[PDB]
């Protein structure tokens, strides 16, 4: 769903 950030990206 656009506007839900279910997870963080790898950094």
């Amino acid at each position: 769903a656009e506007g839900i950030l279910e997870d963080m990206p790898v950094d």
Partner: antibody
Amino acid sequence: EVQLLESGGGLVQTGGSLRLSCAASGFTFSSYAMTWVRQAPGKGLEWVSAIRSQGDRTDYADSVKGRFTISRDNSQNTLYLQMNSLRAEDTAVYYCAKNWAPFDSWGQGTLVTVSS
Amino acid sequence: EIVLTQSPGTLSLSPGERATLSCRASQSVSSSYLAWYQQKPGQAPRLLIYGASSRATGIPDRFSGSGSGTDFTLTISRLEPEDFAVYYCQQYGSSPWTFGQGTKVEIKR
């Protein structure tokens, strides 16, 4: 049924330590970042900390950097918040929440009082 | 840091009236990544709107949200009794995540 359930709050001496846990069920825990938000009594909401799905990346509010460690056990469906060098400003209801942002599922909160 | 300024501090309205809640940001909020929560006394917060304008699941359609950049709005078209609570906005466009100070909506009688 999605459930988040914090544990571990209570009175702590100033400069002492406390660990919080949040048990999760009803969704596949290892697919989501998990989050700690806090609320001082009568005050607004503050973002505290966040951890990647795989325990892979952690982030913190500046006020807690170097004193708080977030962690998670994906074998146990548990989120942790280790709290050191606690001060009165840390007194709050601590909520567990699902996602990096925004937060669809919240726990019931656990009250952490930091006093002598 | 992105500072969120909610207004009014308190809103007092008879049920059935239109409630309009403002959230202003000190920086632009990327991707319109702005959420709205409801919080009743002694309860955890409840997600109402995400992405500035999308309703969460099981949220009645009288809650609607609009805006972009620095100016965001939560509209409750007909205030129902279960609507009287504190309303917080929250940005997730840039780290760290921040919330506004909240708006108290009480019912006038």
